[PDB]
Every structure is written in C-alpha cells, then in structure tokens.
UniProtKB/Swiss-Prot annotation:
<dbReference type="GO" id="GO:0008353">
    <property type="term" value="F:RNA polymerase II CTD heptapeptide repeat kinase activity"/>
</dbReference>
<keyword id="KW-0805">Transcription regulation</keyword>
<keyword id="KW-0963">Cytoplasm</keyword>
<dbReference type="GO" id="GO:0031647">
    <property type="term" value="P:regulation of protein stability"/>
</dbReference>
<dbReference type="GO" id="GO:0004707">
    <property type="term" value="F:MAP kinase activity"/>
</dbReference>
<keyword id="KW-0418">Kinase</keyword>
<dbReference type="InterPro" id="IPR000719">
    <property type="entry name" value="Prot_kinase_dom"/>
</dbReference>
<dbReference type="GO" id="GO:0042552">
    <property type="term" value="P:myelination"/>
</dbReference>
<dbReference type="GO" id="GO:0060291">
    <property type="term" value="P:long-term synaptic potentiation"/>
</dbReference>
<dbReference type="GO" id="GO:0045202">
    <property type="term" value="C:synapse"/>
</dbReference>
<dbReference type="GO" id="GO:0006935">
    <property type="term" value="P:chemotaxis"/>
</dbReference>
<dbReference type="GO" id="GO:0007173">
    <property type="term" value="P:epidermal growth factor receptor signaling pathway"/>
</dbReference>
<dbReference type="GO" id="GO:0034198">
    <property type="term" value="P:cellular response to amino acid starvation"/>
</dbReference>
<dbReference type="GO" id="GO:0005524">
    <property type="term" value="F:ATP binding"/>
</dbReference>
<keyword id="KW-0723">Serine/threonine-protein kinase</keyword>
<dbReference type="GO" id="GO:0050852">
    <property type="term" value="P:T cell receptor signaling pathway"/>
</dbReference>
<dbReference type="GO" id="GO:0051403">
    <property type="term" value="P:stress-activated MAPK cascade"/>
</dbReference>
C-alpha cells in the first residue's frame, strides 16, 4: 500500500506514480497514472464510515455522480474499495484529472469576454441537466467548477445536493445553512431551506459577477452581512417582493434596514458586455419566483453563439437511517467497479 504524507493511499495496482494535491474539506486527494487508459487521473480518499453525516454525503454524491452522464458534470471513472463490508474502511473515488478550477483561475488570470461566455454556457448546460434530474447542487462556487487545459468545464462536489422539494422550501428567519456563504441566495437568510432550483441560479449569478471582476461580488463576513452585501447592490426589496415573505421575523428584519438604492451593474462592471449584465441582472433577482430559469438563461442573447437545445441534454432518470445501513448502501452502490 503506497503511503502519501504518512497516510495510507492504497490505490495500487492500476494507479501508480502518486503526487499529493490537498486535504480538501474532508479526505485526502492525489493525482496518479492510470495504467489501463494511458492518462493521469485524480483520486480522493474518503473515510466516512464512523459518522452518519459523512456517510450520507458520500452516498448522495456517489449515487448522483454514477447516475449522471454529462460532459459538464465530472464522472466517476472507478471506485476502489475492499471486497467485503468488514474490510471496507476507505473508498477511493477516481476522476479525470482537471488542470485547474475556476477559483484558482480567477485569483491569477483575467478572463476575456469569450472565456466568461463559454464558461457560463457550460455551467448552465451542466445545470440544465442536474435540474432536469430533479436535483439541486446547492454548493455552486468557483472551486466546484473544474477546468482542463482546453477549458472544458465540469461541475463537481454534490456532497450538499438534494432532490428538489419546493412544497417544503419554507422555514423560519435565520435558519442555519451549510453551503458556502458568498453564493447563498437572499431567501436562505430569510425563509428558505434551499429546496428550489432558484437557489442554484443565484449562485451561478454570483459566479458570473465574479468572472467579470476576479473578486467575489457578495463577500459577506457573517450570515446577515451576506444579505446587507446583496441589498447594497440590488437595493432595498420592493413592496411586492416583501409581500411574498409571509414570515414576520424575516419581513420585519427587511423593514428595519435603511433604504438602499440599486447600484447599476454597468458601474460595478464598466468593462462588461451589456448582454452579460442583462443576464446577470436576471440571475441576481431578489425574488426567487421572478429569478430567471436555467433554460431561459441558456436562451439569453448573451449565449446566442452556443445556444442549441438539441445539444443541451436532460436526464433520462430523474430522482425522487443509521451509519451501518449507509455503509451497506455505499458498498452496494460501488459494487459495479469490483472485479466481476
């Protein structure tokens, strides 16, 4: 069993010449040479079995990524694990090696309009598919958008994904939330569990704004600063938009804030294409009912040179408990990769 940083990275036989990458959120990641197909791959070691919560995210993500086949969503190439539940302590997930990610790209590289347009197109194409499978990603952000040397973009990290549930979207004011703060839609801070498709489009909007300036658009430092960042650009919500917030704690919170006027997009981004800013406006709408849909964002004039609905596939097979049982589901879920 080859070691990496003194941790067992047991992926040999097929996967040789290891090189360390990171410790991620949880679990270790390395590159390696695949000896069947003749390219280098990425491998992530996961050890979720002692915690119910880490099992559910490992299972969600395996089940989703094995169901999904789409050019703009990362595929699982291989899953390495023990032949028996009893010997299974780790799972190794093999994926195509991606040069970089959009977080890394943005901190060092200026994006031309042609790159922003192409990346936004691919984000939206992958998201069309996810949404068509009745799945919500719920943690879209530049680090979950992998790019290779030819700038093919793939959405990754479905650890916080859910099956969509709009009828049960409502919750109280200040409902704690796991997904990354800067890409959270305003409604999460007010009255939403993040169980509707409009929550991903918000994050896409944030990513677009980020691509236009190499800086996060809404870099909130805490739960409710995130909303004051939003409303400093968008301006105070309209009365009609407040009337959609039934929750009185949430409504009275917004009513307590000083009036802010909308900051025009072309002052924040005087270099941006005007069609880009018009699409950005439709994605970063306060009211999630009025927020543009994935398929409408694809049909926007900004993306006109790529838009082709016959080449923007939808999912054939949309979706609709102790630690011990999830380990057994993980075992069953990964069985197809075993010799046999």
């Amino acid at each position: 069993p080859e070691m990496v940083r003194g941790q067992v990275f047991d992926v040999g036989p097929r996967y040789t010449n290891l090189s360390y990458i990171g410790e991620g959120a949880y679990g270790m990641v390395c590159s390696a040479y695949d000896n069947v197909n003749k390219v280098r791959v990425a491998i992530k070691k996961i050890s979720p079995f002692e915690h119910q919560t880490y099992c559910q995210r490992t299972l969600r993500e395996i089940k989703i990524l094995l169901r999904f086949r789409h050019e703009n969503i990362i595929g699982i190439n291989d899953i390495i694990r023990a032949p028996t539940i009893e010997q299974m302590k780790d799972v190794y997930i093999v994926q195509d090696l991606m040069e970089t990610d959009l977080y890394k790209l943005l901190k060092t590289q200026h994006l031309s309009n042609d790159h922003i347009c192409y990346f936004l197109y691919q984000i939206l194409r992958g998201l069309k598919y996810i949404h068509s499978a009745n799945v919500l990603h719920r943690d879209l952000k530049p680090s979950n958008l992998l790019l290779n040397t030819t700038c093919d973009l793939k959405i990754c990290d479905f650890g916080l994904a859910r099956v969509a549930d709009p009828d049960h979207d409502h919750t109280g004011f200040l409902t704690e939330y796991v997904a990354t703060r800067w890409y959270r839609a305003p409604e999460i801070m007010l009255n939403s569990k993040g169980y509707t498709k409009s929550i991903d489009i918000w994050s896409v909007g944030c990513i677009l704004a980020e691509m236009l300036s190499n800086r996060p658009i809404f870099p909130g430092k805490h739960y409710l600063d995130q909303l004051n960042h939003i409303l400093g650009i968008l301006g105070s919500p309209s009365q009609e938009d407040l009337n959609c917030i039934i929750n009185l704690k949430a409504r009275n919170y917004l009513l307590s804030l000083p009036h802010k006027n909308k900051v025009p997009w072309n002052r924040l981004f005087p270099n941006a294409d005007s069609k880009a800013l018009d699409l950005l406006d439709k994605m970063l709408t306060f009211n999630p009912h009025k927020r543009i849909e994935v398929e409408q964002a694809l049909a926007h004039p900004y993306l006109e040179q790529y838009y082709d609905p016959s080449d923007e596939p939808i999912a054939e097979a949309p979706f609709k408990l102790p630690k011990e049982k999830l380990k057994e589901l993980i075992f069953e879920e990964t069985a197809r990769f075993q010799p046999g």
